[PDB]
Design a protein around this motif. Structure first.
Motif, PDB file in Angstrom:
ATOM      1  N   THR A   8       0.797  -1.092  -0.510  1.00  0.00           N
ATOM      2  CA  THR A   8       0.212  -0.032  -0.109  1.00  0.00           C
ATOM      3  C   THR A   8       0.898   0.953   0.217  1.00  0.00           C
ATOM      4  O   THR A   8       2.154   1.318   0.720  1.00  0.00           O
ATOM      5  CB  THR A   8      -1.101  -0.285   1.409  1.00  0.00           C
ATOM      6  OG1 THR A   8      -2.199   0.968   0.939  1.00  0.00           O
ATOM      7  CG2 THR A   8      -0.143   0.508   2.894  1.00  0.00           C
ATOM      8  N   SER A   9       0.462   2.440  -1.041  1.00  0.00           N
ATOM      9  CA  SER A   9       0.900   3.299  -0.766  1.00  0.00           C
ATOM     10  C   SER A   9       1.051   4.583   0.209  1.00  0.00           C
ATOM     11  O   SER A   9      -0.305   4.499   0.140  1.00  0.00           O
ATOM     12  CB  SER A   9       0.647   4.515  -1.984  1.00  0.00           C
ATOM     13  OG  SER A   9       0.137   4.310  -2.132  1.00  0.00           O
ATOM     14  N   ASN A  10       2.135   5.414   0.776  1.00  0.00           N
ATOM     15  CA  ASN A  10       2.300   6.378   1.415  1.00  0.00           C
ATOM     16  C   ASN A  10       0.587   7.866   1.126  1.00  0.00           C
ATOM     17  O   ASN A  10       1.442   7.992   0.544  1.00  0.00           O
ATOM     18  CB  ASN A  10       3.616   6.909   2.109  1.00  0.00           C
ATOM     19  CG  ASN A  10       3.256   8.009   3.163  1.00  0.00           C
ATOM     20  OD1 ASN A  10       1.943   8.248   3.691  1.00  0.00           O
ATOM     21  ND2 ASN A  10       4.240   8.578   3.928  1.00  0.00           N
ATOM     22  N   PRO A  11      -0.451   7.564   2.086  1.00  0.00           N
ATOM     23  CA  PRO A  11      -1.423   8.613   1.612  1.00  0.00           C
ATOM     24  C   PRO A  11      -0.713   9.806   1.624  1.00  0.00           C
ATOM     25  O   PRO A  11      -1.358  10.990   1.130  1.00  0.00           O
ATOM     26  CB  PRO A  11      -2.346   7.917   2.444  1.00  0.00           C
ATOM     27  CG  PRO A  11      -1.485   7.425   4.172  1.00  0.00           C
ATOM     28  CD  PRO A  11      -0.285   6.818   3.021  1.00  0.00           C
ATOM     29  N   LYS A  12       0.528   9.494   2.832  1.00  0.00           N
ATOM     30  CA  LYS A  12       0.628  11.873   3.015  1.00  0.00           C
ATOM     31  C   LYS A  12       1.646  11.625   2.411  1.00  0.00           C
ATOM     32  O   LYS A  12       2.402  12.899   2.892  1.00  0.00           O
ATOM     33  CB  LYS A  12       0.574  11.478   4.375  1.00  0.00           C
ATOM     34  CG  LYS A  12      -0.548  11.624   4.770  1.00  0.00           C
ATOM     35  CD  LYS A  12      -0.379  11.667   6.453  1.00  0.00           C
ATOM     36  CE  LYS A  12      -0.046  10.617   7.313  1.00  0.00           C
ATOM     37  NZ  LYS A  12       1.340  10.114   7.298  1.00  0.00           N
ATOM     38  N   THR A  13       1.907  11.367   1.290  1.00  0.00           N
ATOM     39  CA  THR A  13       3.685  11.289   0.221  1.00  0.00           C
ATOM     40  C   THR A  13       3.155  12.496  -0.245  1.00  0.00           C
ATOM     41  O   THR A  13       2.472  12.705  -1.459  1.00  0.00           O
ATOM     42  CB  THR A  13       3.301  10.170  -0.793  1.00  0.00           C
ATOM     43  OG1 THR A  13       3.617   8.957  -0.724  1.00  0.00           O
ATOM     44  CG2 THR A  13       4.861  10.533  -1.395  1.00  0.00           C
ATOM     45  N   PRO A  14       4.721  13.536  -0.275  1.00  0.00           N
ATOM     46  CA  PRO A  14       4.135  15.173  -0.967  1.00  0.00           C
ATOM     47  C   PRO A  14       4.581  15.099  -2.412  1.00  0.00           C
ATOM     48  O   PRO A  14       5.258  13.890  -2.619  1.00  0.00           O
ATOM     49  CB  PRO A  14       5.325  15.590  -0.330  1.00  0.00           C
ATOM     50  CG  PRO A  14       6.840  14.535   0.326  1.00  0.00           C
ATOM     51  CD  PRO A  14       5.284  13.361   0.993  1.00  0.00           C
ATOM     52  N   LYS A  15       5.016  16.142  -2.366  1.00  0.00           N
ATOM     53  CA  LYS A  15       5.093  16.370  -3.729  1.00  0.00           C
ATOM     54  C   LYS A  15       7.050  16.302  -3.281  1.00  0.00           C
ATOM     55  O   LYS A  15       7.269  17.303  -3.492  1.00  0.00           O
ATOM     56  CB  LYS A  15       4.964  17.700  -4.831  1.00  0.00           C
ATOM     57  CG  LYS A  15       3.860  18.403  -4.238  1.00  0.00           C
ATOM     58  CD  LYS A  15       4.152  19.948  -4.267  1.00  0.00           C
ATOM     59  CE  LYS A  15       2.655  20.426  -4.195  1.00  0.00           C
ATOM     60  NZ  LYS A  15       2.670  22.249  -4.183  1.00  0.00           N
ATOM     61  N   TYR A  16       7.964  15.052  -3.954  1.00  0.00           N
ATOM     62  CA  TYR A  16       9.287  15.361  -3.533  1.00  0.00           C
ATOM     63  C   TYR A  16      10.146  14.705  -5.198  1.00  0.00           C
ATOM     64  O   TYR A  16       9.711  14.688  -5.969  1.00  0.00           O
ATOM     65  CB  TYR A  16       9.438  13.956  -2.833  1.00  0.00           C
ATOM     66  CG  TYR A  16       9.299  12.759  -3.332  1.00  0.00           C
ATOM     67  CD1 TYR A  16      10.294  11.802  -3.508  1.00  0.00           C
ATOM     68  CD2 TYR A  16       7.700  11.987  -4.118  1.00  0.00           C
ATOM     69  CE1 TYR A  16      10.632  10.760  -4.177  1.00  0.00           C
ATOM     70  CE2 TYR A  16       7.865  10.507  -3.635  1.00  0.00           C
ATOM     71  CZ  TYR A  16       8.921  10.268  -4.761  1.00  0.00           C
ATOM     72  OH  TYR A  16       8.802   9.331  -4.914  1.00  0.00           O
ATOM     73  N   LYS A  17      11.128  14.946  -4.274  1.00  0.00           N
ATOM     74  CA  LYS A  17      12.356  14.762  -5.461  1.00  0.00           C
ATOM     75  C   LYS A  17      13.676  14.375  -4.503  1.00  0.00           C
ATOM     76  O   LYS A  17      13.789  14.505  -3.680  1.00  0.00           O
ATOM     77  CB  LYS A  17      12.760  16.062  -6.405  1.00  0.00           C
ATOM     78  CG  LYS A  17      13.114  17.730  -5.648  1.00  0.00           C
ATOM     79  CD  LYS A  17      13.439  18.815  -6.391  1.00  0.00           C
ATOM     80  CE  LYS A  17      12.477  18.592  -7.795  1.00  0.00           C
ATOM     81  NZ  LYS A  17      12.746  19.382  -8.506  1.00  0.00           N
ATOM     82  N   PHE A  18      14.601  13.670  -5.376  1.00  0.00           N
ATOM     83  CA  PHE A  18      15.835  13.277  -4.808  1.00  0.00           C
ATOM     84  C   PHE A  18      17.216  14.458  -5.304  1.00  0.00           C
ATOM     85  O   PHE A  18      17.039  14.696  -6.453  1.00  0.00           O
ATOM     86  CB  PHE A  18      16.017  11.652  -4.627  1.00  0.00           C
ATOM     87  CG  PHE A  18      14.842  10.586  -4.275  1.00  0.00           C
ATOM     88  CD1 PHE A  18      15.194   9.711  -4.498  1.00  0.00           C
ATOM     89  CD2 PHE A  18      13.942  11.173  -2.986  1.00  0.00           C
ATOM     90  CE1 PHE A  18      14.088   8.626  -3.861  1.00  0.00           C
ATOM     91  CE2 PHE A  18      13.564  10.574  -1.714  1.00  0.00           C
ATOM     92  CZ  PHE A  18      13.429   8.967  -2.725  1.00  0.00           C
ATOM     93  N   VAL A  19      17.891  15.031  -4.631  1.00  0.00           N
ATOM     94  CA  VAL A  19      18.443  15.280  -4.619  1.00  0.00           C
ATOM     95  C   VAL A  19      20.628  15.518  -4.191  1.00  0.00           C
ATOM     96  O   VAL A  19      20.039  15.722  -2.224  1.00  0.00           O
ATOM     97  CB  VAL A  19      18.215  17.378  -5.594  1.00  0.00           C
ATOM     98  CG1 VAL A  19      18.597  17.630  -3.769  1.00  0.00           C
ATOM     99  CG2 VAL A  19      19.630  17.793  -6.360  1.00  0.00           C
ATOM    100  N   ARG A  20      20.666  15.420  -4.350  1.00  0.00           N
ATOM    101  CA  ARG A  20      22.761  15.258  -3.681  1.00  0.00           C
ATOM    102  C   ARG A  20      23.307  16.902  -3.621  1.00  0.00           C
ATOM    103  O   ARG A  20      22.733  17.682  -4.835  1.00  0.00           O
ATOM    104  CB  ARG A  20      23.618  14.674  -4.488  1.00  0.00           C
ATOM    105  CG  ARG A  20      25.069  14.490  -4.171  1.00  0.00           C
ATOM    106  CD  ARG A  20      25.986  13.417  -4.276  1.00  0.00           C
ATOM    107  NE  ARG A  20      27.083  13.139  -4.369  1.00  0.00           N
ATOM    108  CZ  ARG A  20      27.513  11.854  -3.373  1.00  0.00           C
ATOM    109  NH1 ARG A  20      25.943  11.930  -2.577  1.00  0.00           N
ATOM    110  NH2 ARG A  20      28.519  12.472  -2.013  1.00  0.00           N
ATOM    111  N   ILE A  21      23.486  17.001  -2.081  1.00  0.00           N
ATOM    112  CA  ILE A  21      24.003  18.489  -1.930  1.00  0.00           C
ATOM    113  C   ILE A  21      25.392  18.072  -1.716  1.00  0.00           C
ATOM    114  O   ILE A  21      26.740  17.153  -2.159  1.00  0.00           O
ATOM    115  CB  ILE A  21      23.320  19.170  -0.815  1.00  0.00           C
ATOM    116  CG1 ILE A  21      23.523  18.240   0.066  1.00  0.00           C
ATOM    117  CG2 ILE A  21      21.933  19.411  -1.419  1.00  0.00           C
ATOM    118  CD1 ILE A  21      22.769  18.721   1.701  1.00  0.00           C
TER     119      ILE A  21
END
Length: 289
Positions: free
Chosen positions: A90-103
């Motif tokens: 089941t997927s997280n119902p509270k998943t935000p607009k996201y992106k993975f980035v390296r800093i």
């Protein structure tokens, strides 16, 4: 002693993963859960692990994913660099607009600290030039995640290891370690314990504006000689520049703080309650005044 915060948006993404006798924090986005791959290792595996092999000796049932008193049945697993990837039913119902980035080191970001899987506020911080992180709020909270919010949650970090020098090492959300750090246990803290002078100084100013003064009462070049001997970081003019606002209020000049520090170093010790010279606090954490 820092300053925690909320961000319920990210707290909804946190879960825990258990494998064997280990439990750590994992990140839950959509129907995927991310966490350090060392979770699958026994204390002995860590002395020299071949993760590809240890993973082979595992199955979806070897893992328990918990969202509080709720369980997330695992239906698949794989490995991405130093991250263990898990597929839940089941997927997280509270998943935000996201992106993975390296800093890169120096860039400030938010970290959600956890005590036994239970969120304990988000803290501001940044990786030192050597890519480690200084912050007590990460002790006993393997797997916590770092990020930056802008309108979209940009995940930029995940905690993996606590070095014995009181500093932490992590990866980006792609499982690639920041720095030369590995996820097995050997001695990798070399050069990771030079005391951060700028922070110690700011910490001293925070002390002044609190009743602590008994330690009050030199030049740059001269001072750094002492910095070299006691394994402190060489103070630069830019570091003095930053402490300007702090020098303003307090009324004590930077070089006069260094003279104060130089004494505490050559002639050791309570300051701000602590019997040790704290260096985990940046001038900025102190500007909370």
């Amino acid at each position: 002693r820092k300053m925690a915060f909320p961000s319920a948006k990210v707290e909804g993404c946190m879960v825990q993963v258990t494998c064997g006798t280990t439990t750590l924090n994992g990140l839950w986005l959509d129907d995927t859960v991310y966490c350090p791959r060392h979770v699958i290792c026994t204390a002995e595996d860590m002395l020299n692990p071949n993760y590809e092999d240890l993973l082979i000796r595992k199955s979806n049932h070897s893992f328990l994913v918990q969202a509080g008193n709720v369980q997330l049945r695992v239906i698949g697993h794989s490995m991405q660099n130093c991250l263990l990837r898990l597929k839940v039913d089941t997927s997280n119902p509270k998943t935000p607009k996201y992106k993975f980035v390296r800093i890169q080191p120096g860039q400030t970001f938010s970290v959600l600290a956890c005590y036994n899987g239970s969120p304990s506020g988000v803290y501001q911080c940044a990786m030192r030039p050597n890519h480690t992180i200084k912050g007590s709020f990460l002790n006993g909270s393997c797997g916590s995640v770092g990020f930056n919010i802008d309108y979209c949650v940009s995940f930029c970090y995940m905690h993996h290891m606590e070095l014995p020098t009181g500093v932490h090492a992590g990866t980006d959300l792609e499982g690639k370690f920041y720095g030369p750090f590995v996820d097995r246990q050997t001695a990798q803290a070399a050069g990771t314990d030079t005391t951060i002078t700028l922070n110690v100084l700011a910490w001293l100013y925070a002390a002044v504006i609190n009743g602590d003064r008994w330690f009050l009462n030199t030049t740059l070049n001269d001072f750094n000689l002492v910095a070299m001997k006691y394994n402190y970081e060489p103070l630069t003019q830019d570091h003095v520049d930053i402490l300007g606002p702090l020098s303003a209020q307090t009324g004590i000049a930077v070089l006069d703080m260094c003279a104060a520090l130089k004494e505490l170093l050559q002639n050791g010790m309570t300051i701000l309650g602590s019997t040790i010279l704290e260096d985990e606090f940046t001038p900025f954490d102190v500007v909370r005044q």
